[PDB]
Amino acid sequence: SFRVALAGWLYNGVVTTVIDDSSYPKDGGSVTSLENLWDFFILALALPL
Amino acid sequence: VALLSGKYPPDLVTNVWYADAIYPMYADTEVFSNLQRDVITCEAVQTLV
Amino acid sequence: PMSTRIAEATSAIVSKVGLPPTASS
């Protein structure tokens, strides 16, 4: 996935690379759950690429 | 008995619970079929009169 | 041998998370 994201920078107008739906926190999420917070942290560092 | 006895799961967040419980209910076209049936009923009564 | 027999029996007798409850599970 990392190398595919790197290769997708050359074809902006043809193909769009987005984060998969499953990666986002489940059913909304709450700051209440540790598992959820980590999902958010993982998503936050991978979104900018 | 219902008034005097009632409890929630040990942990609970209403947002996540309802976002999980309501989603399966919103995949159906029964209400739309009902609207079509209502239109047919009104057309039929006007035609009859 | 007796060592693995004891370990298997202990695992069988003994062995049977942070997330909000859901109607699914």
Side-chain angles (χ1 to χ4, degrees), chain B residues 4-45:
Chain B
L4 291 173
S5 162
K7 79 175 181 70
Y8 291 165
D11 189 358
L12 188 63
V13 285
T14 59
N15 49 3
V16 169
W17 178 275
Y18 278 109
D20 186 74
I22 301 293
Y23 171 63
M25 181 162 93
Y26 279 29
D28 63 79
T29 68
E30 295 300 325
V31 64
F32 301 113
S33 162
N34 291 324
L35 272 69
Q36 287 185 353
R37 179 61 154 77
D38 302 318
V39 162
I40 290 308
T41 297
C42 176
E43 291 290 329
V45 63

Side-chain angles (χ1 to χ4, degrees), chain A residues 18-31:
Chain A
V18 311
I19 298 306
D20 187 10
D21 189 358
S22 310
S23 290
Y24 289 86
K26 208 190 106 78
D27 278 303
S30 253
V31 247

